[PDB]
Structures are given as C-alpha cells and as structure tokens.
Amino acid sequence: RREMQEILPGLFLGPYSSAMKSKLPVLQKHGITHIICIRQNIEANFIKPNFQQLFRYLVLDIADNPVENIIRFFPMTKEFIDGSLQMGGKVLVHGNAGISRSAAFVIAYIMETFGMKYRDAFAYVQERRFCINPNAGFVHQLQEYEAIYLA
C-alpha cells in the first residue's frame, strides 16, 4: 500500500510516498522518467514534484470525490503516457493513497489502449495493487469516456 507496483510494462501506480526524495534510487533503478503527480491544492504541502531536474512531471489538481471531473483530463494523460512509453521511458502515476484518483487514471489508459471494459480493467489492476477503489463518480466517468472513444 505504501509502495509502487508495475501495472503494465513501463507503467507504475503508487501512493505519494513512492516519489519522495528518499525514493530516488528506486525510481532510477526502474528507469522512471515521467511522473503524473495527482493531488488537491490543499495536499500540495506533502504531495508535489520532488525532483525538479530529473523527471518530467504532469501535476493534476484533482479532488477525490464523486462529483470531481476527471474525464476532462483523460486525453491529456493518455498523450503523456504514450509519449513517454514511445521513447522507451517509464511512467509513475501517483496520488495520495494510490487508491481512487490515481487508480482511475491508470484504468482509463488500460481501457483505451488494451481494449478492455471497466470491470476487466479494474480487475486486472486490483490483482496487482490490492487496495484500489475508484469512487463511483470516477467509475461512471471511466464508462462515459469509453462511450466517447468507441463512438
């Protein structure tokens, strides 16, 4: 729960603790080059980019609640992750707990890229990171985005 897991080749999912200063050796050993750092502005005291010069960041100001809009950022994060993986880079996606917001963004990537429905993508990720649980609003938005890209 307090560490990052490889979810699919080159894409890792973790809590904020996985991208703290002290974890640099772990990040470099796994060839991480890009980090999606997700947090509310009120969390920005402890959840923030810690390696200004070493990694490319995407910081997303997102609350973990069922009415928060995350679908607006699915195209952005898909592009960011594709861009890294295409150049042989690797991506860490982290939130606070690595349970709801961060998990939803990894699921969106998996659904679109690997042609999986929500239930199957959720199950796939849960097998790797046992604690994941996107809120219901996020689940609906995942389904809503699939309807978009399938149209």
DSSP for 74-122, please give it: HHHHHHHHHHHHHTT--EEEE-SSSSSHHHHHHHHHHHHHHT--HHHHH
- Do residues 19 and 50 touch, judged by C-beta distance below 8 A? yes
Domain ranges, residue 3: 1-151
32 three-state secondary structure: coil
Which pair of structure tokens corresponds to residue 97? 């707990």
Work out how many domains the chain is built from and give that number.
1
CATH code at position 32: 3.90.190.10
> Distance between CA atoms of 54 and 57, rounded to whole angstroms?
10
Check if the beta carbon of residue 139 is closer than 8 Å to that of residue 121: no
Q: Is the Cβ–Cβ distance between 37 and 48 less than 8 Å? A: yes
Strand partners, 124: none
